[PDB]
């Protein structure tokens, strides 16, 4: 009728339709899972290879938003790289004025509040992009937040985003995780990915993984090559069996 | 829709070829039914 | 973020009407009844207070505001739009008082408050205000009663009504208003002409009255109104 | 049909039409290939003429002394995004006294073409780029879209009837890493020769080659600098 | 009349031929979209907020789902509605509160900090450029000369002072339960109030809570800091209401 | 309710008839449409399973719904 042409228009129902649609553009992307343990956070992206022509392990969906804050995205990728720069810019103005790495509880509320300002006006279009911020500190432990197009942030112990959002949240509910060292989680993540992926709907995939926890001393990296292989071998074995 | 859930849990069993259901069968069925129930059109309260 | 729209939403129709102001006058006529009665030494502004449970605290808001030591308002229509105009008036009064060191005359204040409401029928991306202000004041020896409309016009009255059933109340007042009243009826006769449009029982916390004599405008304490409600005072 | 008049509206399906369309502006453009080795990156572009008395529009635009691009789409937009890159690489010489490394250049194009796909009544840039550069990580190719995504490729093609090239390039992607310089350009031409009609062939008046290497600042070849590469070229039989 | 369309009038915020703003009568329907309910009850020494807390999964952390926000140290408030808009308006409250203290030097009354949340909302009504926020703030806090107080401000602006309110899905049903316990009248001690709030929410939803299904915000005159009661303290009142 | 023939003058019941459906419902014939084979529906392999298990399976193996204790969808 005319309740979808604007973010500035409630519908008679009671809900802004332009934000609804944005969230459905996320649901049509590949899957990313986060899972927080007791001494770190591990990230997992199910990056599809759509040709053999794209270079391997390149054009990632795992940003560094700060020197101790991962960001794993799903959804329309262009708008993702845009947020990853607004966040870097915030987590720099925070170290400038307050002089210490920004606390992830706050970096989240500030990046959600920036997404929210884009669902109010008609002059802009709400972001098509849900994403998780992980972080580790020794004064706060691991924290894992997840933002979405609405502009909502919520603490999580695990979560997933994308086209297999449902199947993956099961695998993490059937997993103890307030007791496992970082090292043991990475094996679980790989195994969960392999399960939730369909090779009858997609071709193949590359498995992307990220520490951030006690192992690395509060930095955020990508898992080293050797440990990534071990997690792929232990994941083919749980699909055999 | 709870009558559906109990059936769906049955169907996974017939698919796997068991003579019995389990605690996952009812866990999956609630996720499935719950997706289509939300998808399939919004229900409004009609007061008298 | 945004820039803002630039194009007026109040537009002429083939009739020669500004449809938006015509409608905003119908919002005015949904609002709570309000009467105004210039006396011969004071002005009375009485109004039907809004409530719809016993949970509301009938002393946390006021439909009768003071704008200056010598000015008052009541309104009829949308309650949010009233707190905006009460607040642009109180500032107008303070710029006037800051340049002439003299309380702003009541003819002046209505003529400026009106030009703010006129600005919202010819500005970009806004709707007109949804209220009619009834402005009393007592300067230079006289009392004054004005009324500005969401249009922007304003008319001096000797007594009037606005809001719901303001055609029954302007008739009722037309007869009962014989000049040279004392200040104390305008209250009495005012309260009566609220009753010609009010269903229920009036109490000290259910209507709000404000007077405005040489001593300056003042809202009437709940006790004070309970006495005029002897329906004999 | 109402979700096509702005970048600002989403579609019930969860896309944006104005961004989809823009990318049809790219498939109207003239075929162009890009592949790499481990020492050279090459841009081979099939120019085009709109008459018999007329020259051919330049597909390869020189950016800096280690970055080329090959446009495909509105040319007025291609020189609006080329001036911004020329300006980004003169900002780096002037502040850091180094060449701007390509990965961090494609990330600025990414930040500047993202913007107008989210503001009212502005459009996406109707041009796709292939960015052949060589810095301290060997050779790169980068495909840019009007959507504002981008990709690190090992050998990409855009434009019209580009799909025919993409398959040729996907069967030979193994051989590319071991080529000398002249052997690589042969591949690029043989891939670009699969995008034509079957009736005509690559001449010297509608091919443009761009080579950047470890010791070779980005050059461009036209007319009779292209002849040392068409001569020696295999015959393509039907 | 009778609901007609002026063409544009359900897509921006301009008057209908009737004399209403369809765009604001819709933004109220967002508050009930949330699916939560919050009651607030005033005593004679303290004001209480009690909120239903709904953790849908076992994954969500339970300590970062809250609806109770600290605006000052002497002003709490509960947010019902679209969670995005909510947090956006709480952020804005905190700003005003601390801007007030900075300009006048005596921390802000609960009266005025609503009047300003109300007036920011009102602008979103009057312009066409944006929608109004789809949420509804209820502030509580002890005033230095009027006892405790409760205020609720709506998406349109209109804000008022209360003795007991609710907001959200069962906003009609609650205020019928409450007004009965207000015309009777009690002492309204600290234990009286918390009692009336939980029993109102518990009967209108039919839950009969676990300490982990409500969060209870409270502010007493003896100690004017805004506390959020832990699960240990909440349970003392639930098993005391199971006895009585 | 029953339909019955009747002698068109002396109103005698002559026989009982088979119930009758509107000719537009008999026109909605159970046709005989040419085989097409589930192998000749491209993609959509999952979909075929989801339908067959709900419609086709209860036509022969209702035994497997009775042993589990459920009713087909």
């Amino acid at each position: 009728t005319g309740y979808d042409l604007s973010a500035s228009t409630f519908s008679p129902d009671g809900r802004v339709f332009q934000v609804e649609y944005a969230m459905k553009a996320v649901e049509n992307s590949s899957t990313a899972i986060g899972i927080r343990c007791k001494d770190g956070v591990v990230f997992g992206v199910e990056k599809l290879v759509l040709s053999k022509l794209y270079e391997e392990g390149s054009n990632k969906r795992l940003f560094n938003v700060d020197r101790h804050v991962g960001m794993a995205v799903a959804g329309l990728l262009a708008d993702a790289r845009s947020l990853a720069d607004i966040a870097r810019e915030e987590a720099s103005n925070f170290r400038s004025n307050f002089g210490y790495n920004i606390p992830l509880k706050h970096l989240a509320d500030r990046v959600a509040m920036y997404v929210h300002a884009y669902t109010l006006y008609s002059a802009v279009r709400p972001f098509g992009c849900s994403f998780m911020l992980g972080s580790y500190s020794v004064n706060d432990g691991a924290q894992l937040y997840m933002i979405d197009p609405s502009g909502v942030s919520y603490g999580y112990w695990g979560c997933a985003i994308g086209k297999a959002r449902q199947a993956a949240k099961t695998e993490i509910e059937k997993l103890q995780m307030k007791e496992m060292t970082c090292r043991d989680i990475v094996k679980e993540v790989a195994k969960i990915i392999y399960i939730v992926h369909d090779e009858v709907k997609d071709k193949a995939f590359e498995l992307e993984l990220s520490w951030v926890g006690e192992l690395t001393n509060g930095r955020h990296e990508i898992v080293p090559k050797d440990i990534r292989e071990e997690a792929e071998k232990y994941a083919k074995e749980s699909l055999k069996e | 829709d709870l009558r559906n859930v109990c059936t769906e849990a049955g169907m996974f069993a017939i698919r796997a070829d068991h003579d019995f259901v389990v605690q996952e069968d009812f866990m999956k069925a609630v996720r499935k039914v719950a997706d289509s129930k939300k998808l399939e059109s919004k229900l409004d309260y009609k007061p008298v | 973020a945004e820039r803002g729209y630039s194009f007026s939403l109040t537009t002429f129709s083939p009739s020669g009407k500004l449809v938006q102001i015509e409608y905003a006058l119908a919002a005015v006529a949904g609002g709570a009844p309000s009467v105004g009665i210039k006396a011969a030494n004071g002005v009375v502004l009485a109004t039907e207070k809004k409530q719809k449970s016993i949970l509301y605290d009938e002393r946390s808001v006021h439909k009768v505001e003071p704008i200056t030591k010598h000015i008052g308002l009541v309104y009829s229509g949308m309650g949010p739009d009233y707190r905006v105009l009460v607040h642009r008036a109180r500032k107008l009064a303070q710029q006037y008082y800051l340049v002439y060191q003299e309380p702003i005359p009541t003819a002046q204040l209505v003529q400026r408050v009106a030009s703010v409401m006129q600005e919202y029928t010819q500005s970009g991306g806004v709707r007109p205000f949804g209220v009619s202000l009834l402005i009393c004041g007592w300067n230079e020896g006289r009392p004054y009663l004005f009324q500005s409309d969401p249009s922007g016009a304003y008319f001096a009255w000797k007594a009037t009504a606005m809001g719901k059933n303001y055609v029954n109340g302007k008739t009722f007042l037309e007869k009962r208003y014989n000049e040279d009243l004392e200040l104390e009826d305008a209250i009495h006769t005012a309260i009566l002409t609220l009753k010609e449009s009010f269903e229920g029982q009036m109490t000290e916390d259910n209507i709000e009255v404000g007077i405005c004599n040489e001593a300056g405008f003042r809202r009437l304490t709940p006790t004070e109104v309970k006495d005029y409600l002897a329906a004999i005072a | 049909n109402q979700y096509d008049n702005d970048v600002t509206v989403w579609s019930p399906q969860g896309r944006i039409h104005q961004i989809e369309y823009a990318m049809e502006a790219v498939k109207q453009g003239s075929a162009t290939v890009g592949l790499k080795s481990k020492t050279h990156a090459v841009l081979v572009a099939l120019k085009r003429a709109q008459s018999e008395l007329a020259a051919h529009q330049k597909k390869i635009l020189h950016v800096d002394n280690h970055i080329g691009i090959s446009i495909a789409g509105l040319t007025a937009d291609a020189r609006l995004l080329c001036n911004f890159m020329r300006q980004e690489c003169l900002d780096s010489r002037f502040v850091f006294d180094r060449p701007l490394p390509v990965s961090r250049l494609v990330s600025l194009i990414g930040s500047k073409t993202q913007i107008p796909t989210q503001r009212y009544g502005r459009r996406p840039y109707g041009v796709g780029l292939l960015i052949a550069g060589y810095d301290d990580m060997g050779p790169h190719i980068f495909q840019t879209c009007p959507s504002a995504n981008y990709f690190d490729c090992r050998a990409m093609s855009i434009g019209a009837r580009s799909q025919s090239a993409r398959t040729y390039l996907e069967r030979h992607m193994s051989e590319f890493m071991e080529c000398n310089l002249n052997e690589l350009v042969k591949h690029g031409l043989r891939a670009l020769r699969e995008t034509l009609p079957a009736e005509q062939d690559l001449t010297t008046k509608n091919v443009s080659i761009g080579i950047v290497g470890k010791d070779l600042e980005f050059t461009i070849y036209d007319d009779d600098d292209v002849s040392p590469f068409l001569e020696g070229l295999e015959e393509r039989p039907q | 009349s009778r609901g007609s369309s002026a063409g544009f009038d359900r897509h921006i915020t301009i008057f209908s031929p009737e004399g209403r703003l369809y765009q604001v009568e819709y933004a109220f329907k967002a508050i009930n979209q949330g699916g939560l309910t919050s009651v607030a009850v005033r005593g004679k020494d303290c004001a209480v907020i009690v909120t239903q807390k709904k953790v849908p999964d076992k994954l969500l952390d339970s300590s970062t789902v809250t609806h109770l926000f600290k605006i000052t140290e002497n002003i709490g408030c509960v947010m019902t509605g679209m969670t995005a808009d909510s947090r956006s308006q709480v952020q804005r409250a905190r700003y005003e509160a601390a801007n007030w203290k900075y300009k006048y030097g005596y921390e802000i009354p609960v009266d005025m900090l609503c009047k300003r949340i109300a007036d920011i909302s009102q602008v979103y009504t009057q312009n066409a450029e944006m929608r109004p926020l789809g949420c509804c703030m209820i502030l509580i806090g002890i005033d230095e000369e009027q006892g405790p107080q409760v205020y609720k401000c709506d998406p349109a602006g209109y804000y008022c002072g209360f003795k007991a309110t609710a907001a959200g899905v069962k906003q009609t049903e609650s205020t019928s339960f409450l007004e009965k316990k207000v015309k009777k009248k009690f002492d309204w001690t600290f234990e009286q109030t918390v009692e009336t709030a939980i029993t109102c929410l518990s009967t209108v939803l039919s839950i009969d809570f676990k300490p982990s299904e409500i969060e209870v915000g409270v502010v007493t005159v003896e100690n004017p800091k805004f506390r959020i009661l832990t699960e240990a303290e909440i349970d003392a009142h639930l098993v005391a209401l199971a006895e009585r | 309710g029953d339909l019955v023939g009747v002698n068109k003058d002396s109103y005698l019941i002559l026989e009982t008839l088979p119930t009758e459906y509107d000719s537009r419902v008999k026109a909605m014939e159970v046709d005989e449409r040419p085989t097409e084979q589930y192998s000749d529906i491209g993609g959509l392999d999952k979909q075929i399973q989801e339908l067959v298990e709900a419609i086709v399976l209860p036509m022969n193996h209702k035994e497997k719904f009775e042993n589990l204790g459920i009713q087909p969808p």
Side-chain angles (χ1 to χ4, degrees):
Chain A
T1 315
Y3 304 91
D4 326 88
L5 312 182
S6 253
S8 43
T9 314
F10 282 112
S11 69
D13 302 341
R15 53 165 174 165
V16 192
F17 262 114
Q18 277 286 267
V19 179
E20 306 298 78
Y21 289 175
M23 294 189 56
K24 183 188 174 172
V26 171
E27 292 302 86
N28 305 319
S29 298
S30 294
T31 299
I33 65 175
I35 178 180
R36 160 201 171 187
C37 68
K38 61 173 176 51
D39 51 308
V41 184
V42 190
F43 283 124
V45 183
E46 173 200 87
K47 194 202 281 175
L48 299 182
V49 297
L50 306 168
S51 280
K52 311 181 63 182
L53 290 171
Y54 297 117
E55 194 51 274
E56 282 302 328
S58 311
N59 48 271
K60 301 181 175 294
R61 314 209 306 181
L62 292 167
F63 309 131
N64 290 64
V65 155
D66 193 62
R67 62 179 301 161
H68 67 320
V69 175
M71 174 156 166
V73 302
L76 177 48
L77 226 181
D79 304 331
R81 297 184 181 101
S82 181
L83 283 168
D85 280 316
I86 295 153
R88 288 179 178 92
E89 171 185 34
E90 174 61 7
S92 294
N93 310 327
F94 190 97
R95 181 182 295 101
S96 192
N97 303 124
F98 302 100
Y100 71 108
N101 292 11
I102 180 172
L104 183 71
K105 176 185 172 175
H106 189 276
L107 172 60
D109 267 57
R110 183 73 66 195
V111 168
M113 197 188 179
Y114 180 100
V115 178
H116 173 254
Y118 267 53
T119 78
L120 283 196
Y121 311 114
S122 54
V124 287
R125 151 181 78 78
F127 287 82
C129 175
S130 282
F131 59 90
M132 303 164 279
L133 306 172
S135 148
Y136 187 75
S137 174
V138 297
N139 308 112
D140 319 292
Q143 303 188 100
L144 163 54
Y145 284 82
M146 185 223 81
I147 291 164
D148 77 306
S150 300
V152 192
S153 49
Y154 273 133
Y156 272 96
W157 280 95
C159 59
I161 40 181
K163 70 182 174 63
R165 175 170 199 143
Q166 293 306 289
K169 278 175 84 178
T170 308
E171 317 311 79
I172 308 174
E173 281 175 314
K174 306 294 182 176
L175 172 55
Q176 284 303 127
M177 57 181 159
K178 311 179 176 185
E179 48 173 66
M180 300 190 166
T181 310
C182 231
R183 299 290 294 97
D184 308 302
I185 290 295
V186 82
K187 304 300 184 295
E188 307 307 290
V189 162
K191 175 175 67 178
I192 289 183
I193 292 293
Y194 275 53
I195 295 164
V196 165
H197 172 80
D198 268 71
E199 38 54 80
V200 294
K201 312 172 180 178
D202 315 286
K203 303 182 175 181
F205 61 108
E206 181 67 64
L207 171 69
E208 290 288 328
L209 295 164
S210 291
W211 299 137
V212 46
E214 200 42 80
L215 306 182
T216 59
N217 316 117
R219 296 213 79 156
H220 172 295
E221 63 179 18
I222 63 168
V223 172
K225 184 54 182 169
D226 58 278
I227 302 168
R228 187 205 312 285
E229 296 173 43
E230 298 309 312
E232 298 170 21
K233 290 168 199 167
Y234 167 92
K236 303 154 195 173
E237 289 179 74
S238 86
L239 276 167
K240 293 185 173 63
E241 315 291 311
Chain B
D1 271 318
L2 310 158
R3 155 79 51 176
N4 214 40
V5 172
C6 292
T7 296
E8 287 301 274
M11 294 296 294
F12 299 136
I14 291 171
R15 179 186 285 157
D17 197 23
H18 303 303
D19 306 332
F20 58 77
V21 300
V22 297
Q23 299 176 6
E24 300 71 359
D25 298 14
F26 297 87
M27 184 283 166
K28 284 172 292 182
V30 168
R31 292 286 187 185
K32 299 202 176 288
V33 176
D35 179 34
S36 74
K37 185 198 79 67
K38 301 168 172 294
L39 180 69
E40 298 299 272
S41 297
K42 299 294 289 179
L43 180 46
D44 317 307
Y45 295 141
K46 297 278 180 301
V48 171
Chain C
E2 49 67 64
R3 205 173 62 83
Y5 305 153
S6 306
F7 46 91
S8 308
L9 306 170
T10 308
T11 305
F12 287 90
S13 57
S15 263
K17 301 300 176 293
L18 296 181
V19 293
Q20 271 315 297
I21 306 179
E22 291 181 283
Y23 300 156
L25 285 159
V28 160
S34 289
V35 303
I37 310 182
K38 165 186 294 193
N41 58 295
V43 197
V44 185
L45 294 185
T47 186
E48 177 55 62
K49 191 177 181 65
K50 200 170 174 44
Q51 64 290 115
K52 56 179 58 165
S53 287
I54 191 59
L55 311 173
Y56 296 94
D57 188 317
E58 292 166 301
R59 301 176 304 275
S60 299
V61 291
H62 304 93
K63 304 178 85 287
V64 194
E65 293 273 35
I67 303 309
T68 325
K69 180 68 183 303
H70 285 284
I71 304 291
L73 293 184
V74 300
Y75 71 97
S76 357
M78 313 191 58
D81 297 73
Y82 172 71
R83 288 177 306 94
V84 175
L85 283 167
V86 168
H87 185 265
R88 194 104 69 267
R90 283 179 192 166
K91 285 173 62 174
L92 279 171
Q94 294 317 121
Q95 297 166 222
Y96 190 90
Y97 178 79
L98 188 56
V99 174
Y100 308 95
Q101 309 175 47
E102 182 185 50
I104 180 173
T106 306
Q108 294 298 98
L109 181 70
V110 168
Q111 193 173 227
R112 290 156 192 265
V113 161
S115 280
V116 169
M117 294 196 288
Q118 191 281 339
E119 180 202 295
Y120 280 65
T121 59
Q122 194 188 241
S123 175
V126 286
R127 54 168 182 85
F129 289 86
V131 289
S132 266
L133 311 174
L134 276 92
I135 312 92
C136 75
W138 194 102
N139 46 245
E140 321 313 322
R142 303 168 50 178
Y144 287 108
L145 172 64
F146 296 87
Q147 163 198 95
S148 62
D149 291 281
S151 349
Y154 62 104
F155 314 89
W157 297 100
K158 277 182 311 183
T160 188
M162 246 312 178
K164 194 173 289 179
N165 313 330
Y166 79 108
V167 185
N168 299 131
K170 285 184 68 56
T171 304
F172 178 94
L173 282 165
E174 186 160 16
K175 308 156 186 182
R176 296 217 179 200
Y177 174 65
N178 297 91
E179 299 199 38
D180 313 313
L181 300 186
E182 181 48 49
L183 174 49
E184 300 187 281
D185 0 278
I187 310 185
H188 196 251
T189 172
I191 290 166
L192 283 177
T193 174
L194 286 177
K195 211 153 183 303
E196 313 301 313
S197 55
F198 170 56
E199 187 170 32
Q201 189 52 53
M202 292 190 162
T203 53
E204 62 196 284
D205 47 33
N206 186 53
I207 65 166
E208 312 173 61
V209 174
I211 62 171
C212 174
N213 57 10
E214 81 298 304
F217 172 95
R218 58 164 289 221
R219 201 187 303 99
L220 289 192
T221 54
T223 309
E224 186 90 79
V225 166
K226 181 182 62 178
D227 305 302
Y228 288 106
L229 282 167
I232 175 231
Chain D
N1 185 235
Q2 52 184 286
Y3 305 115
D4 69 82
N5 296 304
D6 300 278
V7 294
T8 302
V9 294
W10 288 95
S11 301
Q13 306 178 97
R15 48 188 61 184
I16 303 164
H17 277 353
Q18 275 290 292
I19 316 300
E20 287 205 340
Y21 293 168
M23 285 180 303
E24 302 283 314
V26 168
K27 303 185 194 63
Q28 303 311 309
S30 293
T32 186
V33 171
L35 30 62
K36 73 175 185 194
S37 73
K38 58 190 176 177
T39 319
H40 298 268
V42 179
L43 298 164
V44 186
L46 176 88
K47 304 184 292 180
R48 158 206 292 176
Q50 61 182 328
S51 314
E52 298 62 8
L53 300 178
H56 305 60
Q57 313 167 41
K58 294 294 186 192
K59 294 250 75 43
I60 299 190
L61 305 178
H62 191 306
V63 168
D64 200 43
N65 307 113
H66 69 304
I67 296 179
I69 64 177
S70 288
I71 69 168
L74 289 158
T75 309
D77 284 273
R79 291 185 331 263
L80 203 289
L81 283 193
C82 181
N83 280 321
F84 163 68
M85 296 163 67
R86 275 175 201 156
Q87 195 53 35
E88 276 301 348
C89 293
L90 303 183
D91 291 332
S92 223
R93 293 284 176 207
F94 187 84
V95 172
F96 294 93
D97 269 33
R98 64 178 188 173
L100 185 65
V102 184
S103 312
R104 306 180 81 255
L105 170 67
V106 168
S107 180
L108 291 167
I109 310 158
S111 280
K112 186 194 157 192
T113 59
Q114 195 284 322
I115 294 167
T117 75
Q118 197 176 49
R119 299 279 322 162
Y120 199 70
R122 302 182 56 184
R123 57 189 161 74
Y125 291 96
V127 53
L129 306 178
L130 288 183
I131 304 176
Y134 181 99
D135 51 65
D136 298 326
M137 297 287 286
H140 298 289
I141 309 281
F142 280 103
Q143 175 201 207
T144 292
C145 311
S147 46
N149 299 117
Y150 67 81
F151 305 101
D152 197 298
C153 320
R154 54 159 50 89
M156 187 43 83
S157 189
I158 54 175
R161 311 188 58 175
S162 84
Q163 205 66 232
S164 308
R166 272 184 187 151
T167 63
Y168 179 87
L169 296 171
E170 187 173 275
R171 281 183 295 210
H172 300 42
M173 66 176 271
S174 54
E175 310 169 31
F176 292 156
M177 306 305 292
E178 307 307 288
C179 290
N180 63 281
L181 174 54
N182 185 81
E183 183 68 48
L184 189 63
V185 171
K186 294 297 178 66
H187 282 288
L189 289 154
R190 280 178 294 201
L192 191 72
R193 206 211 291 97
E194 299 196 353
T195 69
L196 307 171
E199 52 180 70
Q200 61 189 70
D201 289 287
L202 309 172
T203 73
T204 61
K205 305 305 171 188
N206 65 12
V207 169
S208 186
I209 306 174
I211 302 173
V212 60
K214 172 183 181 181
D215 314 86
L216 170 55
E217 64 163 44
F218 185 73
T219 56
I220 303 172
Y221 298 145
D222 289 278
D223 299 84
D224 315 306
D225 315 315
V226 182
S227 298
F229 299 107
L230 296 184
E231 290 173 85
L233 190 66
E234 208 186 296
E235 178 52 44
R236 189 270 266 105
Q238 216 75 43
Chain E
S1 193
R2 293 193 185 201
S4 38
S5 283
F8 302 111
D9 63 327
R10 294 180 199 163
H11 313 286
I12 46 180
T13 325
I14 63 94
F15 287 110
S16 318
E18 284 197 307
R20 50 174 56 200
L21 296 175
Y22 280 140
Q23 208 61 266
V24 191
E25 291 176 16
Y26 287 149
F28 281 95
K29 294 190 189 172
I31 302 162
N32 309 307
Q33 196 67 91
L36 289 314
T37 306
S38 56
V39 176
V41 184
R42 186 167 88 193
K44 290 168 192 168
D45 305 83
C46 57
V48 179
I49 291 168
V50 57
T51 317
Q52 193 181 358
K53 176 166 84 273
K54 189 188 158 194
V55 198
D57 283 312
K58 304 88 184 181
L59 305 170
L60 279 85
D61 184 88
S62 287
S63 322
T64 64
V65 289
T66 56
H67 288 295
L68 292 170
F69 295 110
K70 178 178 298 198
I71 272 52
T72 330
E73 299 302 271
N74 311 354
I75 307 178
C77 88
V78 60
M79 295 303 290
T80 43
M82 305 170 64
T83 308
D85 297 72
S86 302
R87 196 81 44 76
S88 186
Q89 195 165 268
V90 156
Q91 230 301 104
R92 181 63 154 290
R94 287 168 180 164
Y95 181 105
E96 289 307 293
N99 200 48
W100 180 283
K101 186 65 180 57
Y102 178 67
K103 285 163 67 179
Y104 311 137
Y106 72 97
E107 75 79 45
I108 182 169
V110 197
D111 178 19
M112 304 302 297
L113 168 64
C114 199
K115 189 180 184 57
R116 253 177 219 172
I117 296 311
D119 192 276
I120 297 305
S121 291
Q122 185 276 342
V123 187
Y124 298 157
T125 299
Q126 194 151 22
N127 311 346
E129 313 153 47
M130 67 284 292
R131 63 190 180 96
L133 300 175
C135 62
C136 153
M137 187 181 269
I138 292 178
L139 302 95
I140 60 165
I142 308 298
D143 212 80
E144 62 269 1
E145 65 187 39
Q146 307 186 73
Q149 286 196 124
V150 193
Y151 282 85
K152 178 172 110 294
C153 56
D154 294 285
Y158 182 94
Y159 80 107
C160 205
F162 289 100
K163 299 188 188 62
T165 334
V169 181
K170 298 284 192 310
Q171 177 166 8
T172 65
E173 200 49 53
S174 280
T175 62
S176 299
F177 175 108
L178 285 165
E179 68 178 44
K180 287 194 179 182
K181 315 294 183 180
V182 165
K183 61 188 186 180
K184 301 170 182 291
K185 217 67 188 173
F186 309 130
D187 304 280
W188 295 110
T189 50
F190 173 90
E191 187 66 54
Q192 182 60 42
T193 309
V194 182
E195 154 168 37
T196 295
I198 295 174
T199 55
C200 163
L201 203 70
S202 172
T203 57
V204 75
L205 314 175
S206 312
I207 301 171
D208 306 280
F209 300 110
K210 313 301 181 177
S212 37
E213 292 297 305
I214 58 171
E215 47 187 328
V216 176
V218 65
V219 64
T220 54
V221 64
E222 286 75 34
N223 176 244
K225 309 294 178 183
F226 173 67
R227 294 177 306 289
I228 300 178
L229 301 182
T230 62
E231 301 203 333
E233 315 165 73
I234 290 170
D235 196 80
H237 301 71
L238 285 176
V239 296
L241 284 174
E243 299 309 277
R244 294 177 274 158
Chain F
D2 290 330
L3 281 171
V4 292
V6 180
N7 178 323
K8 63 182 177 50
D9 301 291
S10 174
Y11 294 91
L12 311 169
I13 301 177
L14 264 288
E15 70 159 275
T16 301
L17 295 169
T19 67
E20 185 176 6
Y21 312 81
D22 200 299
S23 282
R24 290 179 297 275
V25 174
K26 301 174 174 303
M28 292 183 186
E29 183 189 343
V30 178
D31 18 24
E32 301 189 347
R33 61 181 46 131
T35 56
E36 317 188 355
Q37 305 181 4
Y38 300 110
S39 57
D40 299 25
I41 308 170
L44 306 170
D45 186 61
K46 176 173 302 188
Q47 280 57 324
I48 299 161
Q49 302 314 324
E50 296 167 337
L51 180 153
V52 161
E53 296 150 6
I55 271 74
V56 180
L57 187 63
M59 301 293 177
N60 307 127
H61 308 79
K62 80 292 147 42
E63 187 57 20
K64 301 184 66 182
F65 294 86
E66 298 164 0
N67 292 334
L68 193 59
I70 64 163
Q71 308 74 25

